[PDB]
Design a protein around this ligand. Sequence first.
Ligand SMILES: [Mg+2]
Ligand SMILES: [Zn+2]
Ligand SMILES: [Zn+2]
Ligand SMILES: [Zn+2]
Lengths: 133, 773, 196, 49, 43, 65, 160, 114, 180, 264
Amino acid sequence: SNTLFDDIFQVSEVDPGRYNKVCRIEAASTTQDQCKLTLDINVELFPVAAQDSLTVTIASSLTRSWRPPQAGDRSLADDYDYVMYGTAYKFEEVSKDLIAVYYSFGGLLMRLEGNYRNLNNLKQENAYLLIRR
Amino acid sequence: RGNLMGKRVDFSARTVISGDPNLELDQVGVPKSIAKTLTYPEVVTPYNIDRLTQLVRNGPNEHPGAKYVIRDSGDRIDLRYSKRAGDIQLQYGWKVERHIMDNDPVLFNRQPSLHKMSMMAHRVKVIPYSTFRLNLSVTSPYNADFDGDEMNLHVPQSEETRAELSQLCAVPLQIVSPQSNKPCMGIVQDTLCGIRKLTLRDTFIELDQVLNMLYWVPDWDGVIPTPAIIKPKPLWSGKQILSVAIPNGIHLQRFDEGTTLLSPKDNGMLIIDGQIIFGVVEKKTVGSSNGGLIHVVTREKGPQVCAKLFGNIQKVVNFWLLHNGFSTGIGDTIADGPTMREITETIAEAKKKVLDVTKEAQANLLTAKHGMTLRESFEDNVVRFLNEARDKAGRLAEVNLKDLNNVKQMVMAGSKGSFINIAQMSACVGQQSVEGKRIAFGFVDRTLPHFSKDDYSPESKGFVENSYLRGLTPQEFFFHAMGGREGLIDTAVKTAETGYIQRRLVKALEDIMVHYDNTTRNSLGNVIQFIYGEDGMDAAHIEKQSLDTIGGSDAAFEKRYRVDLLNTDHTLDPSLLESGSEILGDLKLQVLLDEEYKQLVKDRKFLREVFVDGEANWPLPVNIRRIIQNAQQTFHIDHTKPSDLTIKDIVLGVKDLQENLLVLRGKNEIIQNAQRDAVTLFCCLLRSRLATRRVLQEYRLTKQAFDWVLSNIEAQFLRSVVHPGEMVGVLAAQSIGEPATQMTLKKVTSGVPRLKEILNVAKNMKTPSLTVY
Amino acid sequence: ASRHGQKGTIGITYRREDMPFTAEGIVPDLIINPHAIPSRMTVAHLIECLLSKVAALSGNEGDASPFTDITVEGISKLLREHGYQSRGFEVMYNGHTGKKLMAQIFFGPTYYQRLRHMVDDKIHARARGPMQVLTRQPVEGRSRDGGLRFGEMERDCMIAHGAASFLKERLMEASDAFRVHICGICGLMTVIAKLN
Amino acid sequence: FDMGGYFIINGSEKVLIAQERSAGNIVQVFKKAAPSPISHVAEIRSALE
Amino acid sequence: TLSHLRRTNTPIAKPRQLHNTHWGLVCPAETPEGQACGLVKNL
Amino acid sequence: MIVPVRCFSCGKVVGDKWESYLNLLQEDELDEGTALSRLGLKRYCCRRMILTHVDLIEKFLRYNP
Amino acid sequence: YDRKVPSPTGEYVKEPEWVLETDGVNLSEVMTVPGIDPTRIYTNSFIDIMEVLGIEAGRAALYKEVYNVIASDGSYVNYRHMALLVDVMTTQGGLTSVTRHGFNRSNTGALMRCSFEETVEILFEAGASAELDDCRGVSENVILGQMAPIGTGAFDVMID
Amino acid sequence: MNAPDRFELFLLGEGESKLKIDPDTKAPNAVVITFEKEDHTLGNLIRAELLNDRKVLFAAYKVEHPFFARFKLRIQTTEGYDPKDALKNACNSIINKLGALKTNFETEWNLQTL
Amino acid sequence: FIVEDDGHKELKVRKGHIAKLMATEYQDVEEYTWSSLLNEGLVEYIDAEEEESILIAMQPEDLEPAELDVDPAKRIRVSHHATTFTHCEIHPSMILGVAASIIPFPDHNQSPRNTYQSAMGKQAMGVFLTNYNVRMDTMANILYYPQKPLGTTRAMEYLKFRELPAGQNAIVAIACYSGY
Amino acid sequence: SEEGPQVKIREASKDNVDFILSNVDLAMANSLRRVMIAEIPTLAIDSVEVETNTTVLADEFIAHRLGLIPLQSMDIEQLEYSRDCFCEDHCDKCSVVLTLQAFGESESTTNVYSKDLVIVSNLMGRNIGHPIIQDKEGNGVLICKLRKGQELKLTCVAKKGIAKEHAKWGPAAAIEFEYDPWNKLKHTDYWYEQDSAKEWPQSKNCEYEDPPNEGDPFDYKAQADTFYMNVESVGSIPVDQVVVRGIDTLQKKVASILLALTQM
RNA sequence: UCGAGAGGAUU
Ligand SMILES: [Mg+2]
Ligand SMILES: [Zn+2]
Ligand SMILES: [Zn+2]
Ligand SMILES: [Zn+2]
């Protein structure tokens, strides 16, 4: 029960799809070349302008009821400023030794393709996303 | 026809109707005054004598009560005024005429009842006010408004009479209709407009709004879902909160114009395990249709679970729309200034086209089209010209209609609206039609006395350049008044012939009952169909499903279906089966693959002969697209680990399955061959989807999951048979009569008069024709 | 009903507290739905709600006469001078919670007509009531405490459900059941009935 | 504001409604149908005022 | 009451449709529905 | 048929302003819009109680019994 | 016209073709011409198709014209309902119309036909011809006020 | 004719208690309270006040039918914490807030001179 | 109205002959009435047969000589392009009946919708007569507090609808609220 | 000054009060408005017996009108509901009896104002039953008009009640309500055609809140705490006791729950 | 009991 993926991305396109509080972001992975992602982001909470640099992570934790944080006792496992919860509904296979995963953060959708995440992102429903500044 | 076919009867009712979403679907709102008046004889039992004696003590003045008491001798006891009404010793076997109470079966009616689903049972919910309360989503199989409409009610008087309402004529039993092989009831106006704005991704709700929304589901597990967004402020999506209404184990896939697996427009729909994945819910998702959400839950979960699903969906969506609001002003019809400047420019270009064509016609330079008079070519040209400008300016308006335009959103959800209404309200209403033609000359050589004679221009022939918002001129108003009276005439005319047609259809087919052999017969016993519907299946448990043996190239047919055991490149990889390396070049086993492939090729020949147009989407009695997703979900499947099946389990199992899909149980050769004829198309689908490559590569089953698929398909098929005794000709007559009543609107006899000529077989048709090849 | 074919019965009676309100505390006397508007295209209904608003504030009679060169934009120019939304909308707060409604509501006065139909004048009920002598069937109409007709079109539809035993109760025990004696050789209603 | 225009018979305000008719003493030309042996007709509704 | 004093009953080949000559004399829109539409019309 | 006491929408007492209203229109020769604003009616819910009202009771008492 | 036909590879592709459309019918002497396909020609007049191509070829010509009426308004009805109507007209061997003089000429008892248009003279001829009635009809027992053989009424109940 | 008497909105009828307590099935620390002869006037002020207390999990009301006046309230709390104790202190928090409002308002009233 | 040549084609009636009518309207000296208009030759009685032979202008501004910047929101009205005028209509609103003349803005409306109200507007409750208390008719229904309409046709004045109405100015909000 | 809710009054009158209501929950001010409209007790007529009526109006017309007549209820807390008392029909401790007499003696038409109502029952020294006259002329309110020869004679039995039973027991009418005049909370989605700012009018309360500088992002934590309000009174109860009793009646309503809970 | 008329229903 720990971090499953980490990378840092530079955004290329922000697309408001006839919307006011939601944009479709388009970013490739820096420090790599054959890895890019397409993600839906609530702009009103975290403003994501063009040419930003977004540290992105995915964990499995940190069913049961969602109680409020209530205190510092239920300490957050994040120094980020954005988090979401999604479900793994499709894992695409673009080619041999290449893989793409699809997530749905309650209607907000996530595209992510790459090579080396083939030890995590299992078929379990539980899936998180965390985005730093 | 008026005292024997139908007659006035006791235990009747009539009131006005009104819609209450907090009423359940099968519930009905019976006021107390009518409930105080109606009665049901309940014999006294040792179980209910404690309740029944209490109801007599209440008295007939206030409900719950009882109007009479019947003893063994039968001398009636009037409880309205009797000296011994207070003290009564109810011996066993006495009859008590108690008042109608909650959760009782009553027949809900409507006029006209030209429909099987217009006479349905209802649960009684006694309510204080005077109207007949009903759910919103029961308007469709009654065709009711609340403007002035009245509805009747009848009450059973015996136990078997009570059972037939509850178990055959209930609302959930008649959700799926034999007519149109689809449901009738669906989510409606405020729910249908609310479900669109709720399920938008821009729409988000906070915790205080969620908890009220969450508790509003009546039966609910009590777990709060983890929010979509948690870090800045915990926010729930409309898609998140709506998923609580949809039960676990429901799956749905839908594709339209732009449907990626990302869906940037959020069109399409994908539902997995009762939590919707992406999309915007609208009329195509929830309106009563082929493969709708109600079509899934009624077949999979059952009638009562789908009936309660109407309640939980409405109470959540109405609650959001309660606290969000929705309206419609005249700014929802006002278009942009520059958009209007293009619209009248488009009309002027069309009017100049009519001028220049008229000058061409006036100089006799027109080339007469073959098969028509020269003057008829003038009308055919100009009418098609003006309809182009109307349709262009109307589609010019829908470009300029912003996303917050309240008229557009009702059309965007398909609640109550169409494209043409936007064109008439904003851009240009257009040409008027009188008996298929333009405005004729009632005056001598002119349509109106304000015009010079022999004026064929659209301004003088009935074109309304101005729109409804812009303001009609007196000439344009009178021309519109001329055309509108025809539609009021046609509406009054068409309803007269339709009710006669439905009478002729019912009285011809009333004896048509499927006997206890599936031989459709009548009172004399003359066979009409040897198998009902030529297959023997009920139209309710029927779904459209694509069979892909028809489509695709012969090469793509091979790559999808060719398993050559004795090959290296056309054999299944042993990562797809446990015995992959062991089963290679097996001569006693490869014969089973090619024999399978030989019937699949013969099946492709059989279907391509019949379905010449190439359409594969066709009504078939058992869905397999849904059933495999059940086996994919009930048993957790991973693509990495291979199956645990021999090929001989698959091919001999399917061959064993076809022998058991029974329709007729005669041992005779003619009936058994007719049984082979009856299931031939369904087996053609079943062999296509239960193929050796398809099972082990497309949806990698296991031995246990495969035997359940054989178990579900056999049971669903056996349940989806026509039950003998079903009156089907009366059902078939109403199945054509009801959509005929909705028929109201190149020179071909069409619509209702064409339907009149077909039935009343015409020696002299108005428009006969030959189609030559 | 209004003056534009928009019929409609009273679904419920709400008090002022439950009703939504504007910033000036004005409450609607009557609430209708947007979904009855585009299907019937009653734009004059929508303009009468707008024009009567400006007529009330100005205090002068609103001119809704036909074939008059009067524009909505000219009317909406006047309503902007009175400090409102020009096209008729008003910020409305939900009376249940005090939370603002996201969709601003079309608000204005509209001349409405009370129809001659009332529920209590139309409500009917019968069990074991009066019977005509000729047919031995219940009398016609609600005026004589009569019963509703279980007509042939209902008999047609109820056949399709397969409710045969329901039909016998509807055709015998509900009304005009009778017992007669017939001779077996002479198969007609003939027999001397010395029952007692 | 009662504008009159009605008879009062047995206490009930009876109104004589207008009746519509084609004009008399006019020549009218009516084309006959296809299966009719005659092809045309000229009709006049002759009646003294 | 005003509209019942201006009404024409027609006892009874396309009569019910609104005619061009009906301009200025009979009302274009005021007519009953259903049973006899266009036969009964108001001035 | 006679001046209502209160506006049905809000409930402010409007029945007392009628005797002033016609006298505001006659001896002062004022405009209808300024007459309602002078008499304390500032919302259009109560404003339509006086403008749209036609006092039919003057015709009823003309009948001698 | 636009029509889909198999390519030699196998996929369905759009093959356009020219088709003549007329305003008259004598199909007995139209198919016997050169240059046409006498296998797939069609008229919207099903009454002549019964005369020319046989009775059972009139069935599909009857259904297709009914189907074209239904889909003209954008509607949809299942096949078993219309084919029930089409076969009922067809099963007599002629085109039995659903009208007063199309099917009421039958042997279907006496009281079933009395519920339709010609009421008294049907009974008078039944009184004349002394027609014994089967009393198995829906309208026979509804007039008789009995539990007709309608679903629930088809099977009796017995005790062991 | 059929309409009920108007006092049923605020007068308790025949043997009808003001509050009926029932624990919600398939939930821990859950109870539902059948408030009688009340409306949104009372429901929203309790529900918004329960959300301020950070030891309360679930708090929501619903009118079962606007015909009648009986809104239902269901609360869920932390372990070892009956909702009645969470209800009473939150209800008392309104009484302190209302009484402080009345005292603060009356001083501003007397200061105003008209 | 009667149109005849003068220096050019124009109406017979003038603005001076209007004031004699309005002077008779104010006094409510020689009075000027409808029979005075016809006798003087300023109006005519036209039926369906005679109007076959005439050319009618709709508005009396169609006799103005023709000759840019204009308001876009107004209706598009065709220039008649005809000059052999014989008569002019009084006002085009007159073709409507008594019931449809109550309807506000019937030009901005579907033609069945104008029909639909004009068949149940005769059903609306209202004060039919001032002597309802004196008279004894079998069924009478009277509104408590009727109101004149806030949107009035010009033809309402001659139908006495303002002086004897049949409905109230209910404040109406069009809202998707309460699901009822 | 005391901790919790704060109040600052902008302007006031005998029948209108304009105040800011700082530092409260939104559910409080809404629920306060509902009890202020509905559940505040105030006396008005509930039973009328008619001796003689020669008017052009029927009696139920008049019985309707007498209900809407405002009656003073300043000291209404010492009066008792007739449902609570032990009298046979109604007494001096529950009801207040009124009488109305008018005769068309004058040649000209004679009105029947509210000031011509007269009081019969025992007051017992409490400020009740006085028909309020806010008229500058001093004549109360129109009830009927009388020709010469007409007469009217009846009795009016006033009883205590609230607006939930009938709207004649209405303490107030048309209370204003606005919060966030700039929509910095994003509680509403503005419907616009070209520009939301120019088409929508500025609220009058915009000057008493800080404007949103559009360069700053959305405040995703601020909830509604400052509510602008105006209270209008008919005249049956002065504007101070309109809101204060409504606070008290709501306070009484929650206390009945706590009393009901302790008994359980 | 019979004949007649005015409406209400079907978007
Ligand atoms: Mg209707
Ligand atoms: Zn015998
Ligand atoms: Zn008001
Ligand atoms: Zn007392």
